[model samples]
Target: SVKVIATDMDGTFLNSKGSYDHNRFQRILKQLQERDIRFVVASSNPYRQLREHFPDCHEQLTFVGENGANIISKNQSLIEVFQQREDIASIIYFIEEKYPQAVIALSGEKKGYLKKGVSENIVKMLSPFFPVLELVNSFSPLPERFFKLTLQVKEEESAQIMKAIADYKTSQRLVGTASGFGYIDIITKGLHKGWALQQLLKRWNFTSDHLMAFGDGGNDIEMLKLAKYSYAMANAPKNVKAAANYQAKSNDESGVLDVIDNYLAS
Candidate 1:
């Protein structure tokens, strides 16, 4: 039986406008709680940012943040992965040297830090994902430990930029994935949504068979593949659809919840 529900936020759970059926979600939440099924919010977003979406159940939810470099539940960290300082420095230097046009943001446990002078347009684009943003002069001092580093480049330049950093991904042991937008997130190797979900499964003594996941983006591919019951949103890209076992309605149609409701009924 499915005992866990893990979902990606932006394109899978939330509609295009970044909103969802709060009332319907609460109803589902009540049902899940009654059955003791855990609900995890897995996303490239920070914990605090995800908390803002579910103020009522923030403390009850498990979070796989920064694409999975960080995981937390009930304010207790389950798994925390950090990039080595040297690796961080090297990546930053490489980006500055090779992809000078990209805007960078370093994600920490407490907040996201970005160098001053990034374009206002870029800042606006990043604001939604980072609830607490710290603008610093330089990353030399660094902020505590960073879980992910995001680079915003022109949408058309994404492939070229990923290609440019192919060697760095191997040598630095970094895993890079894109949000299908202009954003590219570089996280510690072996630290992705699927890995984070595995940690939770072990902790809770539940296997992948007990999990159901819903997603709509490239980053969600791993987690979708990990779950036995995976649903790709109707609006998901072709690859994302192919990665899942089934296709659900669009986020606008409350696809995640719709699937959950059917599962509960069954």
Candidate 2:
């Protein structure tokens, strides 16, 4: 029996329009609740954004935000993983000096901070993920504990940027991975969707066999592999499709809902 259903937000659950069938979702949520199945929204998006997306059921659903750097359930935080302040400073410096074309944002518990003068286009692009965006002059003095640092760059430059931070991936105790279009999320090492899911499973005394996950990105690879019943969207990248045990229809076809309906039917 599936005890939990965790899904990635962007290309997995939400369609190209950045939305799903609200009435349908409410119906599914009812069924899952009646069946005692927990629903978890696991994404690189912050908690506020997740809450904004599911305002009616925010407290009911479990959240693994900041690419699993922050975990919360029932209005309580389960765990919070943060990069060291010095590490953040160093990364900011490196990006500013070496990769000026990239834009950066820091995800904290209550708000996200971005350096002033970042392009309006980039800020608009990041608004959906970070509901509370604060513009600051410098990152030398961070205001709060941050869980992730997001860099928005040209999609074509993703590989090069990832390569540029290859050294910091280990030395700074950080793990940087591409998520969505033109975005890289940097989180503390060993803190990822899979690790966050594991923590929840252990807490609930449920194993991988009881978990069902759906995703469509490289960042989703870990969680997809960790779940026994993992589904990658048909529109997902070839590598992402290769990571999952099964392939569902594309998000436009309501792939997630289709899979759930089939699961309940079986």
Candidate 3:
């Protein structure tokens, strides 16, 4: 009776090339819709970027984006969490004063914002993830509201940066997880993928039992734990792999789709 199937994007569903099988997904999507199952894509990415990947069914899918501060379906807002302007300004000042070398990205409602010091290489690398990213001279006076903030630091400074972040004034309400790629994504406390999904459940009058979730990273932990038929991808990091009841083929093997295909037939 799985009425909802949720999967994380980057490492759980999309392969290393940052793509998925379009035709196969369409076929599976139709089957799930006919079976009354809702397909949910839960990711730490922003809504704009997440939608870019599923142009075919963007209106038919559910998205939990920006570390779960932004949720949308059928191009309509289900729920959204935005950081206060003063909080973001304070955070920028703190980072500038202490972690000057850190590369910052403000994921907001309109477009992603990159701090002044971001280099061409980083921008080129990140543009694929955020098509509407813009470079700003200052963090203050941001034209749009932002939901999540990200900082990228060198591996040598990563641990110290995180430790220092824990002591910041906003640390209580602002928390984050390391991306293993030297990026630390910060979102408001008590807001995340699982929390968003839980809200959706209550709205739909469903429970955790109705969810079949798949994930491959730390950010996806709560969602994995919430589902009975949870799947942690084979490529998942060590701890993430243990977060679920079962293991699936790696994202490179198109594991998420294969699992759904086999499940419907069985």
Candidate 4:
């Protein structure tokens, strides 16, 4: 009897088009609710982004954003909030100086920064889903703090840019990982999925044996290890498969539904 399910958004629950399988997910969600099971949305994305994904479930689901720096309860109440003040400014300065041509997205409380040269088309596509602003003037007057910093690069340039920024200390509390094409998310250290899920479990009085998690990326590794039934999508990376306890079909194949139908539904 799984009591909770925590899932990643991109490449896991949401398809490449950034849309969720409404029918399939809604069915599974209804089943979970009927069984009195809890659902959680865990991602490096901001809380706003998660809300956008499951507007209908907002009242019933908990959210762990920016990895785990920000945790919100089912009632949209803040559970735990963590952010680096001085580090945010330092990172902004470092990126501006080192990679002037690169586009950076700063995920703050209410808004985010979209550096110049970023594809207008791409940012436009993302705007509907996220709070993105073009950085035309200066990186000054930084917000009180933020949860994540995203660096966008071309598919081919990502590796090179990651290597270049590897040695720099944007924030002593930051943990960096890749998600999309030419994109990397810098979340707070000790804020990985595993840690966040543990906190959620503690608050909800649940245990690892009652939790199941699904994902298809390297970022999912930590959380997968913590789940009693960890599922890696068939299309997931090799490393992700290595970390998972079981294999599910690809997202396009309704892999998540298959699992729910087999175990929870049965």
TM-score of each: 0.95, 0.95, 0.94, 0.88
Superposed Cα deviation of residue 190, candidate 4 (Å): 1.4
Report the backbone clash tally of model 4.
0
Model-by-model lDDT, in order?
0.87, 0.88, 0.85, 0.76
Decoy 1 TM-score against native: 0.95
Backbone clashes in model 4, listed as residue pairs? none
Tell me the tens digit of each residue's lDDT in model 1 across 61-154.
8999998988889878877888888888888888988889999898887778889998787778787778688888887756677888898889
lDDT at residue 229 of model 1 (Cα atoms): 93
Report the C-alpha lDDT of model 2 over 35-63, residue by residue, as the tens digit: 99999999988887887778788888999
Q: Model 2, clash count?
A: 0
Which run of 10 residues does model 2 get worst, by summed lDDT? 166-175
Write the number of the candidate with greater lDDT, choosing between 2 and 4.
2
Assess candidate 4 and give its TM-score to the true structure: 0.88
lDDT tens digits, residues 69-98, model 4? 788886665655555667766776877787
Full ranking by lDDT? 2, 1, 3, 4
